[model samples]
Target chain A: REVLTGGHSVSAPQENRIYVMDSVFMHLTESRVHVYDYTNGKFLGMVPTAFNGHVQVSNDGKKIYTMTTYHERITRGKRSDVVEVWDADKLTFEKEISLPPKRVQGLNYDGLFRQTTDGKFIVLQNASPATSIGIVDVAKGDYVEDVTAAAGCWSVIPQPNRPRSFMTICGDGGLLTINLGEDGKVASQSRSKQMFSVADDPIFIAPALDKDKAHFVSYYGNVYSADFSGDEVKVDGPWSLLNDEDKAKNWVPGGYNLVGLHRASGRMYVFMHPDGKEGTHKFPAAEIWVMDTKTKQRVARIPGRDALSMTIDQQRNLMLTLDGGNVNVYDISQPEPKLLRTIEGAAEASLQVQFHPVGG
Target chain B: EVLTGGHSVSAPQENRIYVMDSVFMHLTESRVHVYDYTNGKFLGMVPTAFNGHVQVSNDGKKIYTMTTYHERITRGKRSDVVEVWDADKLTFEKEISLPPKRVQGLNYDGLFRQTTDGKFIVLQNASPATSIGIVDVAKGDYVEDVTAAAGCWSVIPQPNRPRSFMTICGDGGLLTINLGEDGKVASQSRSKQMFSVADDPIFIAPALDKDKAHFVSYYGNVYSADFSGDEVKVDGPWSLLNDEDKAKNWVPGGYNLVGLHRASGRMYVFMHPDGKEGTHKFPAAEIWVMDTKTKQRVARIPGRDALSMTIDQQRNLMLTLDGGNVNVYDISQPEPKLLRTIEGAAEASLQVQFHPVGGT
Candidate 1:
């Protein structure tokens, strides 16, 4: 274990200056954000970040943003509304924009924001008590005056391989399709009928053949897999993999609460303990799992320590991990661990971490 | 919904009791052991059985057994010894026994199956420690014994339900076998192997035809699917009869789990809502899925509250279920519940709910 860049390796990054991509956590003491290149496990930059409820990144990897003091746990009093934007590549403070109705309402919300081709990012704020979604002009630190759609907005995803395109799903199975306009704003938009009711974490994976044909998802007790081409929800599946008792037996009870779908391979992966049951969620020594998106079946189950974040390597193997205080690397190209490069000084407060393709 | 026969709706007659065999409880909560099947006629059992490991023959006509000192096995509380007995004769068959250890699985494979066949029975001990013990139970003699590794649990037979058995060494991995032509238990060539099976494959039944096929399905991967030297025909994870309510999650909305097939082409996969252990998603299950002559998931018998099940009569597609006891289903109109439960068995643990209504 070698300390690569950050200061301190044991405490939660309290500086609040980094964008955490690791299962929603940073790598050093103080809330530090991580910046990486696509070629190698490069730790390019870091920033201070104090997450309220949600944080996100753009597709091009040019910038990072988050809404802070959400439902207000630490930083501000509870629910102090504020969305902050940071220069991901430069690792510097860009701007801290206040949320509409800037009042600190005790209202809880889970939100998603995706960067678009035209540069403007789309945002969806979902609350069981009240729900809403829309496009946001980060340059202005405000909404674009257009509400996308409504209902229980469970999750959203950008169309794989499609430019300026995105999809969002609300409770009651309502789906909204939107395209980006020339002004870095959402343009042509539409909605689909009630499709799926109970979805887990909705995601999109670029298909193997057709870049436009990507796999869709929502995972919970089961997996809801689908494909969205246009305004249509092409396919839907439940228990996309195993049976009920098995699903119930292997559920991950809210550990960062995220599921991922890889674009090129159409593979879906989640963190779960096949040998675990509720109340007895003993973290399996190595609990990282990868499943086939199309089939909803598990393909790889590597032993990883509290694996927080992961990335795909050149050979299509899995890289990037967040366990104790370091970023552990493994050559998942094969079953066994081909390498174990630990980035030292990476201890403490790293809410998230990643590497640059060129080992930034 | 209604049980019948003996004193209560759940009471079981001898044959019926055999169908609902109980498990051995040597460990806190592990594998099961039957008490002379569901019926009480063959009370012939291991005299010291507090926790016992049981094995059924290829024909399912006879069973071999062992005793362990566990809570369910002994009332006096002293760790009892491990002993053998005739499953049907319910009488002591082995003169020597081992010290108390939690026994999880037992398999009679190789020529060690019978004295004339030079048979040997392998017992997988899980609790207190893990190990596989091969005891040569040759009719009137108890021969040599061998122990290996720890964490060994199940000892299942190979495809075509052959004389060889596959023991799952959970932590030690898996072990395969080859029996001598004389049916003698060949212990020399035993090779240690990786788990081609999933950690939680509760049910494992090899196909009727086996001709040197290596592929099998475990953790969602298609392995030795083409078991025979001949080309294996893999068809539909098939299609399902569509209905709006049923397509709520994925187009093929259903949490597909465990499955069993009849001698006929018909196959069944049980599904349930993806929820927590106790999260009984009302209308718990959607369809009692069944296939026709082809492998497609063509039709379903829409019902609720059904768990693990097995085919009874193939022609009528009759099945026995275990929810609040045994309830049979009408193949043609699987919609409504059968009028009453199978007579006899009461409070059945219901692991193997097979009626073999199709049984000769």
Candidate 2:
């Protein structure tokens, strides 16, 4: 082959890869995640996991974190829960750090664990018959202390610039922010007033992080934006993604991971369905609604691949959707989301959608 | 007959007896039957929901219970609450909503415990995922649930250490959790395995004193865990059975088998002969009272095939449940003498208590 090379004016953000879980609940002890190129269906390798293990790609994309548990005798004997680290490119476990035997033992999800903005720690959500946050020191491969949230608060929503802090969604429709000192000790903790009515309309647990603010979508088509950059969470109030016409038809946002944002374009894509009612917040999407987050207006409507959860690659203009058993990749550079390829069965038992990490 | 002399009379010196029905078959409802602790004279009963785990206030002025109610029949809309009743009137006073996940099974101790300061009510919850619920009775709010070890059960709030409580893990370890403001888990410390689950396992229920919570193993050994710190300091593999008694295969038995008169430091256990595996829940053939301070058997009273036992230290009385009768004993004597037997107190009771909870 002739030696030839071509380059674009714009530098690539990532290696054009993504992470999808083969979340095997039937044999939870053997659950795992697969890494592959989003542009094509080239398999890179796999990161082994166990029992509802939550996965997080490092900010630098050089390491992968698996917060999970293990049994010495398969499904019995001694239990060893840890924060396992794997080399992203080598696809091998680097080291296992101890956890306080209280990491959440349910299905894997993005909100359960996040890497701090400083890339020094992994903040994990813990449910030991109780609600608390487990902080793991990434540099030392050591599990740090835990910070308990309010009575009904859940998730560890990482901050954008605060290296020693994070946020959680409370049961009372408010956001709880907890900040730790540089020494890994709690610095301060507080909560905001009810940002949304939990009884009237409940927002999804998984929100798309846009810098310091989280973009949340409610089941009733209400879009909520709250900024966590201040001493307390700052609420931007709520706006509707659908008009009165769509509301008449009972249109709503639904699914596990319902919101996605491409920061480069300020475009947000969500799984929207019609004829929604109570208990329909988890219904599969009938179509994809693309909106301008800044203007709070709809930009375009595209056919959904029965998308359940989705994520976007800012540099590549690629949109990936997690459906029943496959991932449909879309080229969003165009006005519409054009189907580029289908990484068949990329996520057999996917928990959430995620693109390869973009190093800061 | 003088009508004035024949007027209805309530006990003045008589102890207040409280019998709890497990309601095993009809689990939707439970009853706390009241009577004269000294005479076993049946009075009235307070109907509650679920297992009806009860805890008396430090001043013996209130009765707190963690209960559950279903809006429709047995499984409609569910609600869990911490109900406070007038200890003297035996009437409901007030209640605070809980997470609606209180453990529902045969009566178990440590399900609801009042801190010595009377600031918090620690209750057990198990959406089948065991956790501890803190109802800050002093603050008049349900603080939140504290998650514990994976297979850990029970909640033993420390006596003087208001924010500390301990639990029984299936791994034969004692795990303690301390709380800060708003009932947030402050710190967790666990002791090494004190007993072997495969060989001898201790009960989740323990008899409490001012400083120690005494546990009896299936094979008749006593393990007293000192709760002076946030973590447990356990001692004693001492025998509940002397060498002679061990030779005869004498072992402690029954569901709620242990009792303690904190003022006198006396520990009582239900004993049955020819004990072997699977006989842990058998009815008692004899009641062995021990001088815990000296770690010696003080007296052995004849048991009326009692499956449950409790005490009224104020009136120096012992109450044992057998069949449908509550057998009251004058325990002021070295060898307790049967005082009176009340019939139909409870048909299938595994637990009993004294109103105002006589001991410390």
Candidate 3:
């Protein structure tokens, strides 16, 4: 692993930057990752990809790494999955790292590929009969070995303070953790002993994080908090987001990418619907419920569109939502967020929107 | 609702049956026909939104059903529902909404079930991933959904355990989930691949007792497993088709064509001739009985195009349902003897189950 000044990689600051993944739904042969200036809603050029995959920003925000499954381009080559790295400032392709056969497919969330806090390695998920995560040394710009993870694991989140460590929620309602050695291979694999009951309420793959603490909300509005700061991850607090009156009213969270956390403000934003029960989770909510993590109290409910995905740039007080392929930006610094501007045709088949880390 | 009954409603009866009319999977509406076992008399008919599974409450006071895809069948309705019917009255009580996009399958477990304690009703959902919806029957409300691992096709509750249920994964493995005090997923575990994905896929049937689970593959192999404890213990995979029969290529055929009798420790497998690939989903030509304890074939009876069956142990009878009729047999003898057949049992009577007249 290569070390850099300030214990992290340095890149262009992202005070006004955002990225949106776009493609035609069902016509998955081609798509592009679009970039924009969030502050002014200025359109930036796009990064062409064979098919949409996970998107990650380097710690310094100097480079963007994307894993693309060449679904439509398979006729062009025998191998399909590849990772492309782009320089942040120039917005040009820096390097293309081909992945091992069978890259991760389906449910491609924003955090599917995440960089460690120190920006030394980029970790990504892969699929098939079993689960695997591929490691890449970013400074060396080279692909590392693939480490097999527990079967049926989904998107992974990098440990906030630790290097070469990540956690994924398994299908069995338990969390699986992988810690890598200095050589960037698996040093230890551990799973949590406390398994949440997912039979009635399931944790959404989209999670909010603040340093070593991770917060997950079930489809029914129950909150689960886990602290991964130790060798054995400690999971606690499955308090309900709904009171007897709210539950009696049948209010709950819903949609695809269902959660957003403002790390700096210690607040979480969730998409919620009234009379929401079993099938409601599949659709977007009409409101965004904001909750204070420190107090576990719901602070506000703001009007929302029928969005497919959402993300927040806490440092800039900006929030983004992909509403039916359009990008909606909001100034969320106040108690009630005011919609700043809507960028039409900004994304096509995109269902995911993410902002670069602050001051990268 | 119409009722023609001579049977006492207060006493526990041997052969009162509930038949689910799947209607060849294309009906806008379906019916659950209640019948008198000793006589081929139709007692009553309960109309449902569409194809559904019937779960009589343990006290025999209520009937719960998951009317899958209720909106489509009802033409502009909004959601699927788990409807509760008064068992004694044979009339609709209330409808509980199910999780959206409920899983469509040939077996009963795909849509609905009553927990072992009969406190909640469980409905399975499938779209991007497999999940389940829990409905508190007494509360008359849809509880939260509990998501199992992806590829969860069907579920069978442990007979004696109130908090546990088992499901078969798409990959031919078993997943056991336990509920907590709050009726949330407390813990879950998965068993290794028990059957070949390339070869015969196993069809699950309730064990004769709560402590065991019986599985039969299309290739005529019988495997028994004990789910009474935390770890599922699998037993012999003895073949019903012996070396001679295997040489001749006899295989079990049909959808959901397995049955078990706990008291007698007997297993029934439906079979067809060999040499036909992709014909496993067709009806079977014969029904073979085997003693699970001795691993010995007890009887081979000629079968019609029988597709599904279930045991009514209370009445010492087995009911075979086909596209045309309902065949009742005396299962008390070592060799099952044909008792009588009910014609026009209802169009496409696909499933048959027995519920005692009153709580046992």
Candidate 4:
């Protein structure tokens, strides 16, 4: 319709699907989702939206959830509200589950959600004032109970190769491991001695390569690795580099920057700009540095210009970076990647990069 | 009220005064008289006789005139014509004529004549077939004119990037000129005709790129041309970046997709994407961008389109259509949102120019 887009952040909902939404007070008002026709840029249909808050689609792409504001009282305040759900394809409003509203301050999207072999579940980070845990049934859309221990919730991540065990860093200055029960409930929640100082918004986390190994995680500028499968979730070797760096680089560009580890390739990618101290020096060019997780050193720097968000292609070989309108395609096959053909004037993408099945 | 943009083509009409002539019209008879908005030595007027339109500098400093007449408002037929000039002499100097029988629109046809960079002036003509002719104003001699077998129209010289500019043509489509090169057009055109032109006249304007590239829009399409490849066309297809059907009919901001390249690959297309919603929708406005490296569609943002546009490097302000309203876009993002829409206490925004009071 060519309606003037007011001041609001935007991103492509998914490949070939475009959406333009407006968020105010963490509540999405003019949230309109339009599925576009691939061959021709035509709107197929608008996805119905319900509720509003910080929204995120589930890992399996089956359900959509968003945090809403709930006002109970001055004391209870508008804490974290309930997380609303909707069917992905049908766009139908599903059930709603109650939780502290992140309105004033409360739990948010933990991000780590995995079903265990024992039928238990693993998910415990709230994106906001955050910290919470417990097992929730997908089919029934209900959480059996809150597993948040003495500490608050920071980030939740599942252990690699482990059926349903995951790690969570709590506010009480400790890391905890939680396992599920036969009925997909919180079977066990225990704190580990493995712990270290965490950042305010520790957003990125990569699962450990080995089941009992320490996993790598990072926030704005600090880096940390934690292991929490046993009695003590402890910090690994020398990490938390931002502790010594200048403060300017730590400021958030806007939203969450990317950080990931390729478990099989033993490579990790940190999504941040080069260390620029402003008046002191100029940054050559921003890039996504590929590091050897085992050695914890930079292996190679893949050059890119103003990258904002990125996602591995369905094949995971080509990296599609959404800096602004242009999607930069980089070949990750080589240790030192080379700049390929630069295509311009692409669609403005959303924060999330979803790769839907080509067709059905 | 820094918002004054959405310019199709700008040229020097008289001394110190630059005129923004014609937003888009195959036979656009419009011309902007750039007179010093402040107190300055009022240079006697110069007549752009013989079917020529005039664009003068804002301070009555210098003047630029173009004699354009062709079958289609494209890089089509030439009107090998002469430009009558009158400088500080207060009298007509002589006729500066060239080979191309006729030239395309001068508002944004050739290389931007450098008044501040160097006293020398570069007169470029994108004409009849795919070709360009460079004329030096000081020595008042023909510098060099090259014609490629491939059709070409617009051209802009680069001073920063390896390539000089992103240029384009209607038939030839898009082309880029290089700076380091002894003197030549970088590559062949890469744009294809995507929009069906109105039986009405059409016009094409050339915008110089910051780097060795240029931007051009024609028949309701936008394209970026790069000459970095040298002898090989680096410009992608005119990516059908804008859809005219979306534009409002019969307004200053109507069919014209006047564009200018900002830093990075970001560009602003001053055209109405749609007013189909009616005048209540009033002046339909949008900023169309190639936003990517590979000529693809990024976004068509609705703001306000006008007859002419001018930008201030000092304040990062964009002025358009007589400066009625100043619209601001981040220009840093792929999908730059309108940061501010400033209402001016004026009317009839045609051509706007910015002048810094401080000295250089």
| Whole-model lDDT values for every prediction | 0.41, 0.76, 0.72, 0.43
Give the per-residue lDDT of model 3 (tens digit) for B1-360: 988764435423354778887655334345688887667787786765445567677777777776554211222244667777788677677777665676665545435676777777766777758777667777777667676656776667787788677788777677887776556788988877667656766665544466888787767777666877778876546788777788978887765577777788888877887736777767768888888888878988988788888776666778887766888999998799998988878677668878754323
Query: What ranges in model 4 sit over 4 Å off?
Result: A1-27, A31-85, A90-95, A98-130, A198-223, A227-234, A239-255, A276-285, A313-315, A318-320, A324-329, A337-349, A354-360, B1-341, B344-360
lDDT by residue (A1-360, candidate 1, tens digit) is 886784432122212122334223321112334543323434555544433234565544556665544321121124445566765545455676666543222211112544454456655454434555555677677766344354445444666455566666655555676676655465677766655564434332211122454333333434553455545656454555445765666655123322344555666555555544434332422466667665667776666566544444433455555543566656555433444565644534343343322211
Writing each residue's lDDT as its tens digit, candidate 1 over B78-132 gives 3423334444444444443544453533221211122212255555554567654
Better of 2 and 4 by TM-score: 2
lDDT of 2 by residue, A1-360 (tens): 697764321122347768887776544545678777776777666676755667888887788888777653223336778888877766666788998877888765578878777777888888877888888878877777777654468887788768777888888888888887765657889888888888887888777777778888887888887787677888755799998888899989988777787777778889999999988888888999999988888989988778788877777788888885788889888657898888887755885657777756
TM per candidate, chain B: 0.54, 0.88, 0.90, 0.52
Each prediction's TM-score against the native?
Answer: 0.38, 0.48, 0.48, 0.40
Residue A346 local lDDT, model 1: 54
i-RMS, every candidate?
Answer: 24.5, 18.7, 18.5, 28.6
Single-chain TM-score of chain A, each candidate: 0.65, 0.92, 0.90, 0.63
Clashes of each: 111, 4, 10, 97
Backbone clashes in model 3, listed as residue pairs: A23-A349, A197-B185, A198-B146, A198-B147, A199-B146, A200-B145, A200-B146, A201-B145, A279-B100, B208-B262
Tally clashing residue pairs in candidate 1: 111
